[PDB]
Amino acid sequence: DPNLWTVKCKIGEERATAISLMRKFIAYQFTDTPLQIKSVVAPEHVKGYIYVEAYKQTHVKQAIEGVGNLRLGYWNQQMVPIKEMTDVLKVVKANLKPKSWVRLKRGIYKDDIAQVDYVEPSQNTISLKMIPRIDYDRIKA
Amino acid sequence: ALETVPKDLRHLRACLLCSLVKTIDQFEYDGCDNCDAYLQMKGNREMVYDCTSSSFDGIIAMMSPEDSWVSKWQRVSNFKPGVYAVSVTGRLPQGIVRELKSRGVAYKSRDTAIKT
């Protein structure tokens, strides 16, 4: 059973880190310096550090050498106990379903609970069900 | 290979059988690399938008499915190494699940995430 290691990353560059290291692996899997990593876990709920799979601590140090996005947490690689390999993959309730209840971030109806009606397949806009709170142009000038 | 890696981070989805995470261009130009004889999502967009949905989370860099704990836990040990997901929500309609059973493919719910 392979071991799991934790490395520090830049905040806001998790998916970039993953897509960069995967391309590094595919770019060095046929050379004389391959990568001994199995997989790298990048949960969406976390922000700041990622996870990597390797049998020993030297493999991660020999694999993440040369990348500028993992240069900060390069001097230390912590190890989690064996019972934390399962709590990483757990996701609590993506998040796109019709006839659901969502809230707004910007606009006038901030922090107001709303409802979803229809979803545009273009992934550009989403229909929302709310109640107007305007004065109907009687108080404002 | 270079074809299973998403080129751009925008407009990427995940399948509901093997949880293949790729960009919308690769699902149309090439399709599902882990299942092409039962799904046939190469050459059109309606089938790509029907089975494969954007509602998914979690990314893993699957590289050695024959020897890895995460691969066995997600039952992706018999698939091709590449970008995969750990929780792909949704369900297939009753228009493509009936033929998979007659063809010998057991459609399993890849949503390992818990509800409340």
Ligand SMILES: [Zn+2]
């Ligand atoms: Zn699949």
